[PDB]
Design a protein around this ligand. Structure first.
Ligand code: FES
Length: 106
């Protein structure tokens, strides 16, 4: 399924992501290193921060307790559509989802 990661400078990086793969996994395995994923994907670091496009936020399961807590530590500006992408698992229903990657993660 289609996923587009927009870098801070506007560059679009499009990937075909399989079901069950997190957006953090797809990003780091494809060189989209503006997403770090330091903790390994267990919502414990906040370095996979992305801004989910407004037309897709309600299609993604809401943040769990752990993610809400970690989001309090994002380094880039927290926005209403901020999510830790290791928490977004790809499904056909999310086909075409666009996420904007902030300029910093650490
Ligand atoms: S990879 Fe650590 S919170 Fe997402």
């Amino acid at each position: 399924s289609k996923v587009v990661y927009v870098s801070h400078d506007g560059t679009r990086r499009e990937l075909d992501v399989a079901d069950g793969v997190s957006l953090m996994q797809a990003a780091v395995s494809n060189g989209i290193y503006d997403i770090v994923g330091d903790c390994g994907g267990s919502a414990s670091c906040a370095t996979c921060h992305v801004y989910v496009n407004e037309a897709f936020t309600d299609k993604v399961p809401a943040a769990n307790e752990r993610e809400i807590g970690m989001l309090e530590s994002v380094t880039a500006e927290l926005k209403p559509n901020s999510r830790l992408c290791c928490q977004i698992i790809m499904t056909p229903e999310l086909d075409g989802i666009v996420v904007d990657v902030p300029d910093r993660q650490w």
